[PDB]
Automatic annotation (TrEMBL), chain B:
This is Large ribosomal subunit protein bL36. GO terms for biological process: translation. HAMAP family: Ribosomal_bL36. The gene is rpmJ. GO terms for cellular component: cytoplasm; ribonucleoprotein complex; ribosome. Belongs to the bacterial ribosomal protein bL36 family.
Length: 148, 38, 94, 141
RNA sequence: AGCCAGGAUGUUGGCUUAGAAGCAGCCAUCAUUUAAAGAAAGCGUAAUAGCUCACUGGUCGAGUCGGCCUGCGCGGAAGAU
């Protein structure tokens, strides 16, 4: 541990992501291996670039230190180990979906999908955050509904 | 058993314990290190 | 800025000094300028800690005696011959 | 990939999958088949490049037939066939004598970006510098 | 303090040696991915391998660490009617 001019940096990035971000997931890394986070690296990598950071911060004076500002409901998701996956550019994308599909392959756990702060609930794996650019499905029925 | 006037921790594993008014070194690792004050 | 507290010595001598030493105090003196030399006692423990630091001897110190700040510099210190202890201190006015 | 079994990586040949002195029977004998290493590995070898070392990992357990998998080339040996001196040194590490290229050490790391944790594409090139300065090769950036 | 994890790369540093891959030595004691990982403190070996350790991240959730001064005690302490 340093002093006070190093611990704040972690919170600075935490608050920055917590505030300036979007839909976020959770990954209780109780025994993180080497491919577990490596598999997420590629998953997070797909999303634009390096904006889907996922550090192993579950301290009350670390990841819970930036709860007073934004995401003021991580006090219940601060015990044990909670790897907050704060997003950035875009919205929810397939983060929650991917996480669920990545946590269903026995990748440690995620405290029963605690969840971040976006809607007005808590734990709810929804798949209504996937399509958000599709605009060619309304041009498949035009050369088949003319003859009849 | 070494029985000495001067008993000491000889390694990391060596622990000092007093039993029945006798300082003794007992070591989990090395049998040679186990000592007694006399 | 080291601030020492002190009391003026009623009785001086060999026996007295010894007694003082026994009671966790130790004698000391201030001397310099026109003013007469002032004999004082000091609590030992407090002063020893202070004197551990090398800044104690170089810088000016403030002795408080009868509610009066005298600014002095440590001139000489008698130490005990085989203990971490102070027999006596010579302070010079500054 | 989430679970692994057995793996014996070894610089083999891509031109002809049939060695003896280097590998041969030592490349597979504990349930592995040496007859299934020259009918599937060569199939996915005539659609890229063959001749340089190609580390391979056979997914064999105890069901005879296995599943040949691919890999990637070493980044430390990437400054020999795509830089300058092949050895990369020549004398005891004490007097810098090696060198690299300022125009390279960027597109040579993009080829092996399937094994780099660096989220950013330029972040993977930062790790190459350290691998390109193993002995102390001074680049003319 | 225990408890759960890692304890990597260049790299097995070169030699001289029969071999030397942290661990026969002799010598340099550097750099990388950085949360952190000693060209390695102990075990281990034909030597690798393998098993620990250093430091560090987590759990936990209040005191804890080892010097100084002195009081009293313990061992050191076996003899012949």
């Amino acid at each position: 541990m340093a002093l006070n001019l190093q611990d704040k940096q972690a919170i600075v990035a935490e608050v920055s992501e917590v505030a300036k971000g979007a839909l976020s997931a959770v990954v209780a890394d109780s025994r993180g291996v080497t491919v577990d986070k490596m598999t997420e690296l590629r998953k997070a990598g797909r999303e634009a670039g390096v904006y889907m950071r996922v550090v192993r911060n579950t301290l009350l004076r670390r990841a819970v230190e930036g709860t007073p500002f934004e995401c003021l409901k991580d006090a219940f998701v601060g015990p044990t180990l909670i790897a907050y996956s704060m997003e950035h550019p875009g919205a929810a994308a397939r983060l929650f979906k991917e996480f669920a599909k990545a946590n269903a392959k026995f990748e440690v756990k995620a405290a029963a999908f605690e969840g971040e702060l976006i809607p007005a609930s808590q734990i709810d794996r929804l798949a209504t955050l996937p399509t958000y650019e599709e605009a060619i499905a309304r041009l498949m029925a035009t050369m088949k509904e003319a003859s009849a | 058993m070494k029985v000495r006037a001067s008993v000491k921790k000889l390694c990391r594993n060596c622990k000092i314990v007093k039993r029945d008014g006798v300082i003794r070194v007992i070591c989990s690792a090395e049998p040679k290190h186990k000592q007694r004050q006399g | 800025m080291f601030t020492i507290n002190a009391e003026v010595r009623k009785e001086q001598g060999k026996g007295a000094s010894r007694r003082l030493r026994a009671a966790n105090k130790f004698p000391a003196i201030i001397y310099g300028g026109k003013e007469a030399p002032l004999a004082i006692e000091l609590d030992h423990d407090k002063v020893m800690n202070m004197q551990a630091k090398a800044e104690f001897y170089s810088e000016v110190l403030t002795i408080v005696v009868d509610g009066k700040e005298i600014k002095v510099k440590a001139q000489d210190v008698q130490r005990h011959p085989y203990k971490p202890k102070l027999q006596h201190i010579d302070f010079v006015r500054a | 990939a989430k679970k692994v079994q057995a793996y014996v990586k070894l610089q083999v040949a891509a031109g002809m999958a049939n060695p003896s002195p280097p590998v041969g029977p030592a490349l597979g004998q504990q349930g592995v088949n040496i007859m299934e290493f020259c009918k599937a590995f060569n199939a996915k070898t005539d659609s890229i490049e063959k001749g340089l070392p190609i580390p391979v990992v056979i997914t064999v357990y105890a069901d005879r037939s296995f599943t040949f998998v691919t890999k990637t080339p070493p980044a430390a040996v990437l400054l020999k066939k795509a830089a300058g001196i092949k050895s990369g040194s020549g004398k005891p590490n004490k007097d810098k004598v090696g060198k690299i290229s300022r125009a390279q050490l960027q597109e040579i790391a993009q080829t092996k970006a399937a094994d780099m944790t660096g989220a950013d594409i330029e972040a993977m090139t930062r790790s190459i510098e350290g691998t390109a300065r193993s002995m102390g090769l001074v680049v003319e950036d």
